[PDB]
């Protein structure tokens with residue numbers, strides 16, 4: 001998925 | 015409904031002021047001398063002001079890393095955005111953030127140079143053009159964009175809505191749920207149109223001109239990724255991790 005390829009962007013969004 | 019479109023515009027402006035410490039209003043005051051930045055115009059002054067082309071490239075990267083985090087905070091204040099699927103939030107930011115970075119960079123530019131370090135420095139355009147190939151052409155497309163964009167005389171309240179429209183683009187590759195994005199964007203577009211009619215009543219077809227700038231920004235980012243592929247094959251330095259993630263499979 002997209003989520004799995006973007007650890008850091010996910011962290012910032014969370 | 016018009017009053018609601020104004021409340022949306024105001025919410026976005028207030029959000030923008032919370033997210034972005036160096037606004038266009040503040041940058042223009044520094045640039046026209048109404049508030050002094052340290053001027054970097056050659057190698058000697060770059061030393062005074064704190065391999066040169068690579069140091070400058072790395073400085074631009076660290077600024078982008080900061081900007082991504084500011085932009086992400088701002089995106090999370092756009093009504094509807096945090097309720098999107100997380101995959102779609104990430105795709106919107108991945109494909110949008112450089113377009114916003116270059117939009118906001120224009121706020122810190124004149125025809126002769128760019129503010130750095132939150133307005134504590136000013137780096138001349140000529141100095142950047144003097145860097146060894148291919149780094150001498152890194153910034154020149156961005157200055158070219160900025161001179162044309164700044165001629166539209168947008169303010170921070172206009173930019174807040176323009177940036178939101180760009181982030182909520184339903185044509186990014188790999189979006190899972192386009193319809194909610196397009197519905198948010200359509201309302202943002204109506205809010206942008208009303209903002210420009212009210213704030214720039216004398217500026218005919220400003221809205222259409224801004225829609226075209228959104229296309230132009232995509233070309234800027236495409237050209238930048240082309241320059242990066244040149245740099246990566248001619249040099250042997252790598253990107254900050256957050257930039258690696260954004261650029262990986264970025265068209």
Ligand SMILES: CN(CCOc1ccc(C[C@@H]2SC(=O)NC2=O)cc1)c1ccccn1
Nearest residue numbers: 070073074075077078128129130131137257
């Ligand atoms: C010329 N300035 C101003 C900032 O200018 C910028 C130019 C390009 C970017 C995008 C970065 S650079 C890259 O390849 N990818 C990115 O995300 C971001 C900022 C600076 C700023 C700090 C130090 C040296 N000079």
